[PDB]
Amino acid sequence: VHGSLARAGKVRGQTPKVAKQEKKKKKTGRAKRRMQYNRRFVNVVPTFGKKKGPNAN
Amino acid sequence: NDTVTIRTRKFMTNRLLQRKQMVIDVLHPGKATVPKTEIREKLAKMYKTTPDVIFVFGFRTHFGGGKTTGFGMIYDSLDYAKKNEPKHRLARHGLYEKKKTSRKQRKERKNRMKKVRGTAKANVGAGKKPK
Amino acid sequence: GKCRGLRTARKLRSHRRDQKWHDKQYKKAHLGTALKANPFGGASHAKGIVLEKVGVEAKQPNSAIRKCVRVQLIKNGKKITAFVPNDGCLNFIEENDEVLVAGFGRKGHAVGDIPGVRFKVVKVANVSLLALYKGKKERPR
């Protein structure tokens, strides 16, 4: 059919639970600003690429 | 003892209250806050008196330590120190005695006396037996 | 044109005050029949009880069923339909639960493709609908 009133939660009930894995903790506060000022400005990129964004794949 | 310096400023004597009042600033670099029993015996050897009429209070320490400051004064008689002195700082030392009941107790006693008219043969012992 | 002369401030002021009765945002705020008629009665939230799990069809561009309820308010009791804005949270609610319906976003107009709903449900059975989604809180045993 077209899903009238049953299967509420149809896709959350059958999504496979990939586990949440853990990482070393994030530097918070004033140190958080330090480690991302240093990633954007004092790290000048050697190559071109039309200034591709900070989340490229 | 080593560095506990007792200075003062804004000194005044007034014979309205028969007192000598001043602002006391205590210089102590590496100690905690000096007690008031430590202070008032040191003004006695500065002002040529005995520590029975020196009443000090209100010491508050600056951020970082060192200079704490409070207000203090000296009377001219311990009889003067019992008349024109508020009763709490007279009692910090053992010169005044204030052991009353709580004001919850005193207020219920007052409204119980109010309901009993006239008789000294019942107002005095109005419900004092249950103890 | 307009009347400009100095001393016509009775005419300019009395004409401005009865021409403000011709837009929405003055007249729905200053007449009184637009606040006697909304179900919250001049409030941002209201409690009510669940009457019927209902499903409404989305608009023609869309094709889905939106999971809604039929809240009947515990204050000045009157019927609304309200949306349960989550994935599986039609199942966290059941018959005659008490809920806290909120506004749906744009003050008495529907948002999105849900035809004729005006409210959304938060806080079913005194626990939050987000907390039941994330699992920070459970339904009361």
Add this chain to the structure above:
Amino acid sequence: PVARSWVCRKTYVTPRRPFEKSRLDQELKLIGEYGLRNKREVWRVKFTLAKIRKAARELLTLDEKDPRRLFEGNALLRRLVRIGVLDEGKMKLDYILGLKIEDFLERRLQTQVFKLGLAKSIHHARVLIRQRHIRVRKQVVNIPSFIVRLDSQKHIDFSLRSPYGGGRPGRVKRKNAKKGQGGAG
């Protein structure tokens, strides 16, 4: 009723629109080149710099010979000449209207103790102020946003209570003296 004070105001201001890409990169390089904690305390000094220019540009719309901009204006000059953001030589109503945000972040205690060499690595200077190591003349201060005046600008040093100016080391060295002395010599 009450004997309460009742007066408070906001020190910052939020921008007119968010997420404009040229603003938050030129205001990132203030958060990191002077090593501040969050962008609210850049909005702090920007709102400081705002109302000074508010007052001053409202003075510049007035001519020559009256009292009130003598009295407000001469005061405004001597109050920010004594703070170090403007020099004592050229104090005018003209030159305050070119005064920038970078001239106020310099006069903080947080970067006047990096450029006097009591700390390297500007982030370390917060880790010395707030962690109780730096005094103004007789008063230790753990507040990095302390805007230091030009008069008491030479007398910044470590405290006599500090590890770096005085004595009685803290618990981390004193643990290290005792740690090999638990069962041995």
Add this chain to the structure above:
RNA sequence: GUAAUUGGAAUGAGUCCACUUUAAAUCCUUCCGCGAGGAUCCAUUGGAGGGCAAGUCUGGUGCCAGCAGCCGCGGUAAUUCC
């Protein structure tokens, strides 16, 4: 910045004697003693198509479930759901 090895006249949150504070108290300040290597002494709330800063990475679902203030996204390779 990976990745550390460490350690150092670093320190607080906490714990807790003593003064100070106060009508009496507690706080804040002052100062013994302990108290930091996943410093596990753990930072969250929202977003990531456009407006509007940030992914056409990977799996799952297949106009369903849901998202989306607005335009819109989903019908078997979804940069928009889970």
Add this chain to the structure above:
RNA sequence: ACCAUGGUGACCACGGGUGACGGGGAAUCAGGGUUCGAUUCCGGAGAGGGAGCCUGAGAAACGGCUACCACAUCCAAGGAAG
């Protein structure tokens, strides 16, 4: 009491509404405005709803009285106190 027939109104009387206590003020901000002010300051009003009084220099008082209306208290049923 005896007389005269007047007063007010499209420059909005009169009636109705107010989710109306008034003001000092508060948020906003090119100027001009728009909105809020129950709320520590001043002024007013009322102590369940009306009404009538005592005393006092000052009250139509309510942690003063009296009566009706509304609600409610103890009782040994006769009464007492809100």
